[PDB]
RNA sequence: ACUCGUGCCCCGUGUGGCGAAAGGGAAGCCGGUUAAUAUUCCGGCACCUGGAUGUGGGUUUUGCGCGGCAACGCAACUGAA
RNA sequence: UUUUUACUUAUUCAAUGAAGCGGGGCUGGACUUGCGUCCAACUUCUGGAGUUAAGG
């Protein structure tokens, strides 16, 4: 009248679990995607060393969030100045925020991109 | 077609030491969970103890036969269901709205009694004509007086196997207690029938073994243990 | 109705048939767990007269505490 | 007063003993069936010093007889045995020195 | 295993977290460059881990390499529990 | 009434992955004459291997 059992320890068996179907969400408006675009680049760093690399090294220095990670300001750039980089050095200041070299293509003159989009001569 | 010479024996020795043992069934020493532990260890405890008359009488039970007789008089008499009553209800809407007074379109009823308060009050006013007892109350207090309330009150009573199954017989999960006073009389002939039966093949076998204690029954270690030591001394 | 009877019944906690009970009873409890929660009253009178009701919202629990 | 050396070793702390470099306790098989009713063979691995313990132990691996797997204990040795020795252990193990009976 | 998440079938003795910038541990070197950083920037030349699918090569087609007496070798050269 | 020793279910201890506990009956035996009883269950030459069952 009972069945076999081949281990002499037991063990819960295993039930119907079910996934939640609330019927009234807790939030009603999702948030907007915080940290976007133009909250992620701040404003282009104008200082000599900034301007130096621009010529030097074909890349830009932005003041970015402090919370914003490389491939969100990689995709913030493409996005707010049709802007392409091959790669993007992250550091934090002494006063607390962020700064990012972005370096671009090679096809692409980081004078003109400054000049013409970011206002730097 | 005869089976090919490189088919052949390879039988295991499980003796000690000189092979696995089989997957065998381990059943009777598998570590149950605390509430099936505790679930058989409370019957045997139950089994164990001396248990004084009271509760000791509820071990008699009606037999099967009784128990199908009786359930058979008393599904003719069970309560009437919820779309029962709603439709009866409805008719006597449409007598009182025709202006017929009520119980003019409706009869008497005939059911049987249920409820523990109902049923003892039914007894102590003697209206009861035939008591049947679940046997397995969990607290046997609520009924373990009921033999003896129906013996002093002079009404046929019976210890019957499942409050389940009077719980089912009268729309409910338990009902712990039935009792039924007065039957139509296309069947008042059964009635009669039923009580005489009840009586003379429980009450009459169960008069004096309702009286004694319940038994100290060990275990089947300690009977085989006994067995052996009365055999070794004759 | 019967609560009269188990109101007689529990006074007489030296008879043979509460002292069975209360033993039996004693020892299950001491098994399970210090406080946990009771399907039902294990003394319905004393409950409905304490201010027990049999429907939902109500809930007993039994606790065990040392001496 | 203050409370004495003696009363503040069972509390403890700097008195408790140490552990890190002692690998198992010392102890028999389980009781076990083949021991109960015959015997069981182990073969011994390695005699091994035991960091705070005068006597050496012996690291034994016997078969599981219900499993495929293999079991390692530890027992104190008894002198004369050696590594690659055959113990066994059960009532039917023969009287020679290192079986266990 | 299905057009579709939800149908089953096996194994089980275990069944948490924190705790090392000197313990364990995947992988980067040289040259140059700034006023101030660099094994992090620039140039050249590399490596590791993870994921994907290609070209060639190898092996086989009732099957999963070959050689050396051997220690072993060779660019691979199926492999659950 | 007092003491002693019996039971196990209260209670307490120990082991384990809670695997083989207690009764038997099939066989193997060895001991005995109103054919009757007791024992046992297959691993000891070797620092190998033993698992995902062969078979009826
Ligand atoms: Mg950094
Ligand atoms: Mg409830
Ligand atoms: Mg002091
Ligand atoms: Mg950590
Ligand atoms: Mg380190
Ligand atoms: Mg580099
Ligand atoms: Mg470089
Ligand atoms: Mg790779
Ligand atoms: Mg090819
Ligand atoms: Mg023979």
């Known amino acids: 009248k009972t069945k076999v059992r081949k281990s002499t320890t037991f063990h819960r068996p295993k039930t119907l679990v079910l996934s939640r179907a609330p019927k009234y969400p807790r939030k009603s408006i999702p948030h907007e995607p915080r940290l976007d675009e133009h909250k992620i680049i701040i404003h282009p760093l104008n200082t000599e060393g900034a301007l130096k690399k621009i010529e030097e090294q074909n890349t830009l220095v932005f003041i970015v969030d402090v919370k914003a990670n490389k491939a969100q300001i990689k995709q913030a750039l493409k996005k707010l100045y049709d802007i392409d980089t091959v790669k993007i050095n992250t550091l934090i200041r002494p006063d607390g925020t962020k700064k990012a070299f972005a370096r671009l293509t090679p096809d692409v003159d980081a004078l003109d991109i400054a000049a013409t989009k970011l206002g730097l001569v | 077609a005869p089976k090919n010479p490189l088919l052949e024996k390879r039988p295991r020795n499980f003796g000690i030491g000189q092979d696995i043992q089989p997957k065998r ?13 505790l679930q058989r260890q409370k019957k045997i405890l139950r089994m164990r103890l001396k248990v004084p008359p009271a509760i000791a009488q509820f071990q008699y039970t009606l037999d099967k036969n009784l128990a199908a007789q009786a359930f058979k ?9 919820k779309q029962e009553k709603k439709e009866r209800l409805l008719r006597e809407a449409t007598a009182i709205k025709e202006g017929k007074k009520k119980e003019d379109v409706s009869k008497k009823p005939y059911t049987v009694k249920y409820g523990l308060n109902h049923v003892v009050g039914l007894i102590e006013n003697k209206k009861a004509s035939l008591v049947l007892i679940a046997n397995d109350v969990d607290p046997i207090e609520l009924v373990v007086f009921l ?13 019957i196997k499942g409050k389940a199954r009077l719980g089912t017989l009268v729309h409910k999960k338990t009902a712990a207690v039935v009792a039924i006073t007065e039957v139509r009389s296309e069947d008042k002939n059964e009635l009669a029938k039923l009580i005489s039966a009840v009586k003379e093949g429980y009450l009459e076998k169960v008069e004096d073994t309702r009286k004694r204690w319940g038994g100290g029954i060990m275990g089947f270690k300690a009977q085989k243990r006994e067995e052996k030591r009365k055999k070794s001394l004759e | 109705g019967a609560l009269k009877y188990l109101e007689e019944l529990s006074k007489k906690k030296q008879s043979d048939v509460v002292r069975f ?28 007269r304490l201010g027990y009701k049999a429907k939902q919202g109500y809930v007993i629990y039994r606790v065990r505490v040392r001496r | 007063g203050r409370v004495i050396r003696n009363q503040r070793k069972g509390r403890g702390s700097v008195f408790t003993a140490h552990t890190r470099l002692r690998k198992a306790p010392a102890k ?65 193990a023969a009287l020679t020195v290192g079986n266990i009976l």
Not at chain 2, 73 to 81: F, G, S
Not at chain 3, 22 to 38: D, S, T
Not at chain 4, 32 to 61: N, Q
């Open chain 2, 25 to 37: 069934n381990l059943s009777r020493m598998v570590k149950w969970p605390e509430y099936i532990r």
């Open chain 2, 73 to 81: 008089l008393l599904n003719k008499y069970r309560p009437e269901t």
């Open chain 2, 147 to 159: 033999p003896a309330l129906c013996r002093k009150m002079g009404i046929p009573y019976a210890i």
């Open chain 3, 21 to 48: 009970l209360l033993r039996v009873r004693c020892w299950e409890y001491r098994q399970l767990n210090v406080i946990h929660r009771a399907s039902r009253p294990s003394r319905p009178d004393k409950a409905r």
């Open chain 4, 28 to 92: 028999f098989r389980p009781l076990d069936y083949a021991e109960r009713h015959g015997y069981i063979r182990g073969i011994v691995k390695e005699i091994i010093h035991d960091p705070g313990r005068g006597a050496p132990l012996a690291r034994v691996v016997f078969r599981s007889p219900y499993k495929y797997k293999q079991i390692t204990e530890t027992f104190i040795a008894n002198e004369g045995m050696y590594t690659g020795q055959f113990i066994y252990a059960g009532k039917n």
